[PDB]
Amino acid sequence: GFTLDNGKYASVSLGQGQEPIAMDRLSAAHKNGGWVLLQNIHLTIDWTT
């Protein structure tokens, strides 16, 4: 696929403290399908707790 449900790349990396967009993309994409990438989730602690 190629679109944002099949073949998606609408993917955000984890910055400093500025990704509540994470659960946002979750809430949208999981109910709608997709190929969502999240980068740099190890330097982040508490959201990843």
Footprint on this chain of other proteins (rule: CB under 8 A) = 15-17, 43
Closer of 14 and 34 to other proteins (Cβ): 14
Q: How far is the CB of 37 from other proteins (least distance, A)?
A: 19
Closer of 2 and 43 to other proteins (Cβ): 43
**What gap in Å lies between CA 8 and CA 1, rounded to an integer?**
8
Closer of 2 and 18 to other proteins (Cβ): 18
Q: Residues with Cβ < 8 Å from 25, sequence gap 6 or more?
A: 10, 12, 36, 38
